[PDB]
């Protein structure tokens, strides 16, 4: 039984300062007053370094020798582009990279860029550029010669897993190419040929008897905290689904971030069979989202460990740990605690597709499992009751990655 960490959406705010002026605590809060800010963060702000540093040392205390770490990006604060130039973006990525290397010096890391890990934000090109080149240098100790060259061209690559994993591979995607807000890829059907490449990698995995973990930042499908919000342009969403439907047999897991909340996505084939599951891990940043329509969209800082079978990559469980930020900010040292273990929360034997399908059916039919899922969705920040509209937004998002079936579900 192996273990790996999945961390995402650290979002450092470099200028976080405990101040008596509520409007000069953190630029990531915009114009919002930040009253009595604490040293470990505030729900209106992106992460101070002290929170990020806390999260990495909490990982080391919980499991200092993971088989590997998945890191799915988004390192910089939610501020205007004019406040955050290219040099600062790269310095922030480098600082976080060095922290991970310092705390886990012997651990392989599989790292993807998030949509904020660029200047201007979200404008990821389908060709080489200074950011891809420089990040490739930062992550070179983690990259094969082949992955190094591929990262410079498109910030995507695939790597063998280390022993003792029998026949495993991690595929690292740049799904920021597919974000609707990315004008660099408008009018391109296969930017960087990433979909063609991905299919070839997965065909190779089948030929070679390997199983694959796919990771990336921006997920396909919709955002469970609202209605009708998808990140991918529709054509890219369709193409991603087509890849999963063709190659699901070799995909043992999908691991994404970007939402900052805790959820999962089911994939089905045209016979209704469940064929894959994507796990959306919460963020370390607690930052209350500015997305229109979302009310009180903050979360507690979260980190996640997966348990897996090294021989098959079958996912046996996940444990999510969290920092109760409200409590931590009256304390001398933040102390992270277990939030939940998946098998216990949903009374399923493992984290397989069949088990996650059962979890979904219980979320959709049992009030107390729905509420349990909903509390964990914000990393136990919000304990209010998830009513009917909330229920339908979450169930439809978990169940339907496709645009058209999601929309029909929302008629419910
Ligand atoms: C699916 O599997 C196939 C194998 O069946 C795989 O094809 C292999 O791809 C690798 C990687 O591109 C090829 O190896 C390269 O070969 C070329 C030509 O000999 C070399 O130039 C490369 O080596 C140099 O590259 C750098 C310079 O650009 C140097 O810095 C570096 O140190 C090397 O000196 C590299 O070895 C290999 O030839 C093919 N094999 C076959 C049979 O085609 C394919 O890539 C897989 N598909 C995917 C999407 O991964
Ligand atoms: C955070 O604040 C910096 C300015 O802070 C100063 O420069 C840092 C390098 C560091 O030494 C601090 O202690 C200093 O007090 C912002 O950077 C400036 O942004 C303005 C635009 O508003 C720009 O005109 C300046 O050229 C920038 N300065 C530098 C040195 O680049 C930065 O934007 C703030 N970060 C965020 C996320 O808002
Ligand atoms: C990052 O977090 C670590 C761990 O909490 C801090 O290192 C500890 O600091 C305390 C007090 O200085 C010591 O008692 C411990 O021995 C240190 N190490 C460990 C493993 O606990 C470190 O100071 C933090 N760094 C920053 C910049 O905040
Ligand atoms: C709005 N949101 C926070 C839920 C998703 C966008 O995430 P981010 O890329 O701005 O960090
Ligand atoms: Zn984010
Ligand atoms: Zn954003
Ligand atoms: Zn099939
Ligand atoms: Zn993001
Ligand atoms: Zn507690």
UniProtKB/Swiss-Prot annotation:
Encoding gene per record: Smpdl3b
Binding partners and assembly: Interacts with TLR4, TLR7, TLR8 and TLR9.
Gene Ontology biological-process annotations: inflammatory response; innate immune response; membrane lipid catabolic process; negative regulation of inflammatory response; negative regulation of innate immune response; negative regulation of toll-like receptor signaling pathway; sphingomyelin catabolic process
Alphabetical list of SUPFAM superfamilies matching this protein: Metallo-dependent phosphatases
Taxonomic source organism: Mus musculus
Note on cofactor: Binds 2 Zn(2+) ions per subunit.
Residue stretches in coiled coil: none
Family indicated by similarity: Belongs to the acid sphingomyelinase family.
Binding residues for Zn(2+) 1: 9, 11, 74, 260
InterPro entries, A to Z: ASM-like_Pdiesterase_prd (IPR017064), ASM_C (IPR045473), ASMase/PPN1_MPP (IPR041805), Calcineurin-like_PHP_ApaH (IPR004843), Metallo-depent_PP-like (IPR029052)
One of the record's GO cellular component terms: side of membrane
Membrane topology per record: Lipid-anchor; GPI-anchor
Xref: Gene3D superfamilies: 3.60.21.10
Disulfide bonds, paired cysteine numbers: 26-45, 386-390, 396-409
Name of the protein in question: Acid sphingomyelinase-like phosphodiesterase 3b
PTM comment: N-glycosylated.
Alphabetically ordered keywords of this record: Cell membrane, Disulfide bond, Glycoprotein, Glycosidase, GPI-anchor, Hydrolase, Immunity, Inflammatory response, Innate immunity, Lipid degradation, Lipid metabolism, Lipoprotein, Membrane, Metal-binding, Secreted, Signal, Zinc
